[PDB]
């Protein structure tokens, strides 16, 4: 798997020291958050670790992983949900007869004997 950059030049992961290791980015800048106060269990191992844990909900690495499972599952579900909330409304407001419209009204559209129209973006409805 030998690749090149999108805009030419060498291709790869660029620099990964910004998100991993003792040197990394944090939820507060350097002048307001010294590296000494970072909790001991918040080391540069998990992805997207900004050393952010007020109130100390996490206690130690295995609980951190247990909560990481929930965080990742919630994140993926929320990505799908944001896409499915934004796209159909914009499609309906621009001319398509989605018949569901806004997300908080789609549920009641299928009450009684009512059905729902499904738009196959590229292809028909």
């Amino acid at each position: 798997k030998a690749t090149r950059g999108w805009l030419g030049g060498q291709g790869g992961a660029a620099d990964l020291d910004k998100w991993y290791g003792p040197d990394r980015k944090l939820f507060l800048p350097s002048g307001l958050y010294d590296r000494s106060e970072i909790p001991e269990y918040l080391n540069g191992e998990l992805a997207g670790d900004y050393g952010y844990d007020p109130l100390g909900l996490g206690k130690d690495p295995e609980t951190v992983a247990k909560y990481r499972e929930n965080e990742l599952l919630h994140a993926r579900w929320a990505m799908l949900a944001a896409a499915g909330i934004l796209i159909p409304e914009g499609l309906q407001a621009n001319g398509a007869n989605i018949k569901g419209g806004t997300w908080f009204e789609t549920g009641a559209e299928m009450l009684n004997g009512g059905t729902l129209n499904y738009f196959a973006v590229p292809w028909g409805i």
Partner: protein, 219 residues
């Protein structure tokens, strides 16, 4: 067959002495047809092979994209303009360009922006093809495989060669058909499907010879 010395040729049986020496049936679709001797130099031969393959793929796409909208319009979909050589002018319509006629899809109204976006994206992808990019760097210039062969339909060498020959033959047919499209559009003035329907209506009178005197130089 289709490879080696005892392969199909461009003149059928009367082709033993017609094939040039440098065409030895090593590359797909090698019927030994170089009567003009334009690829005696092997480097020029390789460049022409690459040009032929790229032209064939683009012609396949063009033929399919010319056929599809006209048939869909015949099925009963309002395109605004279904004929292939008139489908570019609808960008200037008051309603813009709508994919499949649906007003909520694409709905493009500015031509300069579309041209600029096409220029940037196509330049990037063609540069990726020439030198390599996100998909890969050290692959065959014509058959990269890897990321461009997800289903893995080309893994056993004889099957790969047969598929390559099928590709080149379908591509040559597509190039011939697209040249026909161009000439028919210039001469007849109606869409290719309309031309086929007219020929089927009355073949004996609805042919090319009905337009023979169109370009008479009388003046």
């Amino acid at each position: 067959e289709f490879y080696g010395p005892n392969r199909a040729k461009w003149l059928g049986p009367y082709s033993e002495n017609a094939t040039p020496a440098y065409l030895t049936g090593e590359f797909p679709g090698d019927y030994g047809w170089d009567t003009a001797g334009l690829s005696a130099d092997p480097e020029t031969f390789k460049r022409y092979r690459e040009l032929e393959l790229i032209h064939a793929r683009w012609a396949m796409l063009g033929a399919l994209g010319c056929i599809t909208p006209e048939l869909l319009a015949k099925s009963g979909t309002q395109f605004g303009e279904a004929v292939w050589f008139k489908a570019g002018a609808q960008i200037f319509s008051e309603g813009g360009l709508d994919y499949l006629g649906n007003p909520s899809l694409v709905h493009a109204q500015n031509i300069v922006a579309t041209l600029a976006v096409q220029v940037i994206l196509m330049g990037l992808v063609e540069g990726y093809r020439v030198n390599g990019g996100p998909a890969g760097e050290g692959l065959d210039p014509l058959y990269p495989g890897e990321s461009f062969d997800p289903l893995g339909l080309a893994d056993d060498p004889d099957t790969f060669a047969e598929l390559k020959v099928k590709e080149i033959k379908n591509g040559r047919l597509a190039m011939f058909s697209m040249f026909g499209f161009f000439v028919q559009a210039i001469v007849t003035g109606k869409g290719p499907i309309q031309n086929l329907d007219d020929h089927l209506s009355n073949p004996t009178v609805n042919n090319a010879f009905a337009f023979a005197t169109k370009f008479t130089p009388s003046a």
